[PDB]
Design a protein around this ligand. Structure first.
Ligand SMILES: Cc1cc2nc3c(=O)[nH]c(=O)nc-3n(C[C@H](O)[C@H](O)[C@H](O)COP(=O)(O)OP(=O)(O)OC[C@H]3O[C@@H](n4cnc5c(N)ncnc54)[C@H](O)[C@@H]3O)c2cc1C
Length: 280
């Protein structure tokens, strides 16, 4: 069944420079009976949002002023609708948690209209009404005993976190798991305490974060580079079986393309390569 809820915005804080966590409260104490990796859809009426009305903390405002991103406006004439992945796992009841990347005009074409729905979501504030529908699902985990390798990037953290929490706390899985998240700098990292807790509460789970452009104020000593190079150079290249592992990835298009080609050049079969493609 596909139901529609008119939810209330609990919070819409920045978890990164260009990613907001949309926390929605399900009415009447109900819970969306969804699956990990699943998604819902958000509809929006005709509106006119201005980027100058966005609540961006000064911790993340840096690149917003450097690129003059608050100049953007977005008018929408007819009701629109997009899909967004749940960041929370099924037994986190009462709330729908989303990671929404703001779809600004591409840097290689900066004067096109901004992302319609993402700009509307980034204009939502605590107390606003948000109509969602679903749930829908297409990205699920295989029910085997093979090693699971999770690769994430950008807003792709949401389905990765939903799958990892679902396997460990609901399913109580003892399968070997590992998360590999790629971010630009340290201020783009979030859910760090969430995954550090799971890695400490479970021996079969570890996770690593790699910075492609670490900043001086980051004092970064961890891994550096793109996540496909880090995952390969620090683990997969010495793995006696790069296959026999199920790769669940979700990130930017070039992160996906880079991870796919790295895995297929390792001999990994496409049946063991599962991608949650956001279309962008
Ligand atoms: C199953 C599924 C799950 C998803 N999960 C998530 C999620 O968890 N988080 C998330 O952030 N997103 C997710 N998405 C993507 C999301 O649904 C939207 O595609 C995304 O939010 C952008 O939508 P928008 O309407 O804001 O951008 P659109 O208005 O669709 O614009 C897309 C991009 O194209 C650019 N553009 C606009 N006009 C032009 C032009 N004339 N020429 C060139 N470029 C142009 C815009 O700047 C924008 O960046 C998911 C998608 C699917 C299918």
């Amino acid at each position: 069944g596909v139901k529609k809820w008119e939810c209330t915005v609990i919070s819409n804080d920045n978890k990164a420079t260009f990613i907001k966590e949309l926390k929605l409260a399900i009415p009447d104490g109900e819970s969306v009976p969804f699956r990990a990796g699943g998604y819902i859809q958000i509809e929006a009426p005709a509106h006119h949002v201005k980027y100058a009305d966005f609540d961006v903390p000064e911790k993340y405002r840096g690149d917003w002023d450097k690129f003059n991103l608050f100049r953007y406006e977005s008018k929408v004439d007819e009701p629109i609708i997009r899909a967004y992945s749940m960041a929370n796992y099924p037994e986190e009841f009462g709330i729908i948690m989303l990671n929404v990347r703001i779809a600004t005009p591409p840097p290689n074409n900066p004067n096109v209209p901004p992302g319609q729905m993402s700009s509307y979501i980034w204009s939502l504030k605590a107390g606003d009404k948000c109509t969602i529908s679903g749930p829908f699902g297409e990205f699920f985990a295989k029910d085997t005993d093979a090693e699971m390798v999770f690769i994430g990037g950008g807003a792709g953290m949401a389905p990765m976190r939903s799958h990892i929490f679902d396997q460990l706390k609901r399913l109580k899985s003892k399968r070997k798991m590992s998360y590999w998240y790629g971010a630009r700098s340290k201020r783009e990292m979030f859910y760090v305490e969430d995954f550090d807790g799971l890695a400490a509460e479970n021996d079969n789970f570890v996770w690593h974060c790699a910075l492609s452009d670490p900043q001086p104020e980051d004092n970064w000593t961890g891994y550096t580079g793109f996540i496909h190079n880090v995952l390969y150079e620090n683990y997969l290249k010495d793995h006696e079986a790069p296959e026999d592992c199920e790769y669940y990835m979700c990130g930017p298009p070039m992160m996906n393309a880079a991870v796919i080609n790295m895995l297929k050049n390792l001999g990994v079969e496409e049946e063991n390569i599962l991608l949650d493609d956001f279309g962008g």
